[PDB]
Symmetry: C2
Subunit: 237 residues, 2 copies
């Protein structure tokens, strides 16, 4: 409760094998403004900390009040430094108030600039794992979110960037990339998640290739302060 | 036509299957008899184009003086130049004047920062190939040099970042990464090049995994204004 305000939207992650919802990603949106960027552009270096925790609190409280019984997935801000061994207390308390299991919370790690050289973000990830949080690398395949990360540590989940997913049913190069990356993920005991799935065509290929977790407009758009139901087109068969 | 001067150094790339030297990478050094990084800092937004051409010509003229008979590999600056596909005049004229065949010249595209309108770096890579140049993606697995690039265009060679290579004989995760990337490169008909090979142990493993082209201290250090000969330990190894 400080400077400016905002809320959350939620977007389903679907298990295409069980046809069940795995969970929802919490996405920042304005009080009525529907743009994530608009809000996050209003935050700066002097207030990144106190904003990051309000995201978590808001997302958890909103999750709980909406009746979320699966996983809650939250983006971890690229401003990766500070001491992890104290900023997590606010998060633990929040989960504890709303009786939301820490093991049902996943943090998504992303990078848009090359900082700290793996070993630091590694320390953040390994820490969260030791408290029982799930962990993910986000946007794998774009930005500084690539193979260098996987090399020194492994998250439970890797979310493959939509750029690698797009039109993959008829893109031989994207098919080879995904086929080999899925082998790599398996060797590393990492679960794949395909994001930005926009069409049945992509879905069916990714499902055949062995991907279970998917996210995207084909399933459901982010719902403002709500948990969207998933497209009956795939849930009926 | 602008300010400060500089020179070049050269480091050989070895082909371990044919036991032949593949060629040399040109590395920027100041007149200051071995000054790297210092030169590259002096470049700014106003002369990133004028400094770009200068490196290429110097590299070709020097290589020519030294009697280089194999490949000459040149780092394309992070496309801060935004080369209109017509200002390649300087390089073409330099190769012609110094009788250095254009097909023996390879350009290395490193940090393709941001989704460079995807096609920007793509157009430029495609344009250089159409002229007969060789092309390489540099530092694969470190910077913005990653899978997103490989998805939309393919170079002749991909230089794998030395971070993925370091102590790979010892590192089972790094091993799976390379085993699955080498299969990928092969699917895409791309020749891999292992950078930063420092020890025999690394060389033996990389060689046994199918890597032919390699570069690093193990073979030879960068030679100031010279073409370093290669440690023949890899002779039969
Ligand atoms: Ca995310
Ligand atoms: Ca290089």
């Amino acid at each position: 409760s400080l400077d400016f305000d905002f809320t959350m939207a939620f977007q389903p992650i679907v298990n295409c094998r069980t046809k069940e919802i795995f969970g929802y990603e919490a996405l920042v949106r304005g009080l009525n403004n529907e743009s994530a960027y608009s809000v996050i552009s209003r935050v700066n270096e002097d207030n990144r900390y106190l904003f990051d925790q309000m995201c978590r609190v808001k997302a958890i409280a909103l999750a709980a009040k909406l009746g979320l019984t699966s996983k809650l997935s939250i983006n971890f801000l690229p401003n990766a430094i500070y001491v992890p061994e104290r900023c997590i207390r606010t998060t633990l308390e929040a989960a504890k108030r709303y009786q939301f299991p820490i093991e049902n919370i996943m943090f998504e790690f992303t990078e848009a600039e090359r900082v700290e050289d793996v070993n630091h973000i590694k320390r953040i990830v390994e820490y969260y794992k030791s408290l029982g949080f799930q962990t993910a690398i986000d946007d794998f395949g774009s930005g500084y979110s690539g193979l260098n990360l996987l090399a020194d540590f492994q998250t439970n989940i890797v979310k493959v960037d939509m750029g690698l997913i797009r039109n993959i049913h008829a893109d031989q190069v994207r098919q080879s990339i995904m086929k080999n990356c899925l082998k790599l993920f398996s060797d590393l005991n990492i679960q794949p998640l395909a994001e930005g799935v926009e069409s049945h065509a992509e879905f069916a290929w990714l499902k055949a290739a062995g991907v279970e977790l998917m996210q995207g407009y084909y399933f459901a758009k982010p719902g403002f302060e709500s948990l969207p139901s998933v497209n009956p087109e795939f849930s009926e068969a």
